[PDB]
Design an enzyme around this catalytic site. Sequence first.
Site, PDB file in Angstrom:
ATOM      1  N   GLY A  13       0.871  -1.195   0.000  1.00 24.14           N
ATOM      2  CA  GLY A  13       0.000   0.000   0.000  1.00 24.14           C
ATOM      3  C   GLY A  13       0.888   1.218   0.000  1.00 24.14           C
ATOM      4  N   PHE A  15       2.568   2.292   2.256  1.00 25.61           N
ATOM      5  CA  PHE A  15       3.823   2.015   3.030  1.00 25.61           C
ATOM      6  C   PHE A  15       4.897   1.241   2.217  1.00 25.61           C
ATOM      7  CE2 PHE A  15       0.586  -1.278   3.853  1.00 25.61           C
ATOM      8  CZ  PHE A  15       1.301  -2.468   3.507  1.00 25.61           C
ATOM      9  N   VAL A  18       5.273  -5.556   2.005  1.00 26.86           N
ATOM     10  CA  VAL A  18       5.816  -6.284   3.157  1.00 26.86           C
ATOM     11  C   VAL A  18       5.660  -7.804   2.911  1.00 26.86           C
ATOM     12  CG1 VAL A  18       5.686  -6.744   5.711  1.00 26.86           C
ATOM     13  CG2 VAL A  18       5.349  -4.428   4.832  1.00 26.86           C
ATOM     14  N   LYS A  33      10.337  -5.552   4.555  1.00 23.31           N
ATOM     15  CA  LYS A  33       9.573  -4.387   4.043  1.00 23.31           C
ATOM     16  C   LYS A  33      10.379  -3.577   3.049  1.00 23.31           C
ATOM     17  CE  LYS A  33       7.087  -0.230   5.690  1.00 23.31           C
ATOM     18  NZ  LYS A  33       6.638   0.584   6.901  1.00 23.31           N
ATOM     19  N   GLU A  87      10.794  -7.451  13.093  1.00 25.21           N
ATOM     20  CA  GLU A  87      10.196  -8.532  13.834  1.00 25.21           C
ATOM     21  C   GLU A  87       8.883  -9.044  13.296  1.00 25.21           C
ATOM     22  OE1 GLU A  87       9.083  -6.589  17.542  1.00 25.21           O
ATOM     23  OE2 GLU A  87       9.137  -8.623  18.387  1.00 25.21           O
ATOM     24  N   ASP A  94      -3.420  -8.334  12.067  1.00 27.67           N
ATOM     25  CA  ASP A  94      -3.541  -6.911  12.412  1.00 27.67           C
ATOM     26  C   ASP A  94      -4.900  -6.621  13.022  1.00 27.67           C
ATOM     27  OD1 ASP A  94      -5.276  -6.180  10.199  1.00 27.67           O
ATOM     28  OD2 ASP A  94      -3.620  -5.198   9.022  1.00 27.67           O
ATOM     29  N   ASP A 133       0.412   8.039  12.467  1.00 23.84           N
ATOM     30  CA  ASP A 133      -0.574   7.157  11.725  1.00 23.84           C
ATOM     31  C   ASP A 133      -1.147   6.026  12.563  1.00 23.84           C
ATOM     32  OD1 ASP A 133      -2.223   6.524   9.529  1.00 23.84           O
ATOM     33  OD2 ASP A 133      -0.541   5.441   8.513  1.00 23.84           O
TER      34      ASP A 133
HETATM   35  N1  LIG Z   1      -1.727  -3.487   7.724  1.00 19.24           N
HETATM   36  C1  LIG Z   1      -0.976  -4.690   7.316  1.00 19.24           C
HETATM   37  C2  LIG Z   1      -0.224  -5.444   8.488  1.00 19.24           C
HETATM   38  C3  LIG Z   1       0.481  -6.761   8.034  1.00 19.24           C
HETATM   39  C4  LIG Z   1       1.609  -6.470   6.952  1.00 19.24           C
HETATM   40  N2  LIG Z   1       2.720  -5.588   7.497  1.00 19.24           N
HETATM   41  C5  LIG Z   1       3.596  -5.923   8.511  1.00 19.24           C
HETATM   42  C6  LIG Z   1       3.618  -7.276   9.001  1.00 19.24           C
HETATM   43  C7  LIG Z   1       4.558  -7.580   9.972  1.00 19.24           C
HETATM   44 BR1  LIG Z   1       4.453  -9.457  10.622  1.00 19.24          BR
HETATM   45  C8  LIG Z   1       5.451  -6.724  10.597  1.00 19.24           C
HETATM   46  C9  LIG Z   1       5.379  -5.398  10.135  1.00 19.24           C
HETATM   47  C10 LIG Z   1       6.164  -4.225  10.407  1.00 19.24           C
HETATM   48  C11 LIG Z   1       5.623  -3.304   9.512  1.00 19.24           C
HETATM   49  C12 LIG Z   1       5.913  -1.909   9.362  1.00 19.24           C
HETATM   50  O1  LIG Z   1       6.738  -1.347  10.239  1.00 19.24           O
HETATM   51  O2  LIG Z   1       5.292  -1.262   8.463  1.00 19.24           O
HETATM   52  O3  LIG Z   1       4.647  -3.767   8.705  1.00 19.24           O
HETATM   53  C13 LIG Z   1       4.522  -5.041   9.090  1.00 19.24           C
HETATM   54  C14 LIG Z   1       0.896  -5.737   5.804  1.00 19.24           C
HETATM   55  C15 LIG Z   1       0.082  -4.460   6.156  1.00 19.24           C
END
Ligand SMILES: N[C@H]1CC[C@@H](Nc2cc(Br)cc3cc(C(=O)O)oc23)CC1
EC number: 2.7.11.1
Length: 271
Positions: A13, A15, A18, A33, A87, A94, A133
């Site tokens: 997205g 960001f 990942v 990421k 990590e 989420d 955010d």
């Molecule tokens: N909202 C979603 C959460 C799951 C996935 N990102 C995601 C999964 C995992 Br295990 C660890 C992190 C650390 C970060 C970060 O610092 O941006 O994003 C992560 C995809 C986006």
Amino acid sequence: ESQYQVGPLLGSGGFGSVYSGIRVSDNLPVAIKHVEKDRISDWGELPNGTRVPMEVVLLKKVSSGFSGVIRLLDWFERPDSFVLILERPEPVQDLFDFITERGALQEELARSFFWQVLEAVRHCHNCGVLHRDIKDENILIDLNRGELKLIDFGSGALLKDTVYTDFDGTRVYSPPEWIRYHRYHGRSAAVWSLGILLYDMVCGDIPFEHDEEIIRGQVFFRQRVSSECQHLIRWCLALRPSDRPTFEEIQNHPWMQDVLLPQETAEIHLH
Ligand SMILES: N[C@H]1CC[C@@H](Nc2cc(Br)cc3cc(C(=O)O)oc23)CC1
């Protein structure tokens, strides 16, 4: 590269993208990421002058054994991107997905999650970092331990006491002073986003979808929510920023008393 085995794409997205991965030497689960260089708006520098994304500076500032904030484990620079090794708890979900599945959360459960997000945000601020955010998509739940982890510092800034006049986090979590004036102070904008987040947990979706609604600040509850929880949400969502509670006032609020421990939360609500 030879240090990490890559598994499934977990999400992408604004960001970046990942992936799930494993650190080859010890089988540690990680997240991998990827952030495109020409998408990074702020750069910082390390004590030695390597130029890096500000996201990496902020992550290193909050980095610790404290498990309420995601730990940055390593990073690499590539010709057109940086790769961050973070990590990964396992199993994880989420909070946005959790709320999709479960709907509006029982207050005891919201209380435990909200309390942990408060301790995490306080840790950011003690470390000089403003996340900008806070929302359910940026919170991970370590399902075995009942521990929440704040993630994605890619909209964040160094915490300062003067006004911010830029913002690139999520508009429906942003405060009315940002919508109207393009100006906010970091702490009171953070507490507004926490008001939004707490309403999202206890009602199963956010209260405001439109600028007009954010600016009006009138809050309607579409699920049955205790008067104490509604008072705290409406306080966090005060229109005037100096009328919002500090973190100390939120955690001393009557609705926050007697919080479950994270382990107890996993035992009662997650298994
Ligand atoms: N909202 C979603 C959460 C799951 C996935 N990102 C995601 C999964 C995992 Br295990 C660890 C992190 C650390 C970060 C970060 O610092 O941006 O994003 C992560 C995809 C986006």
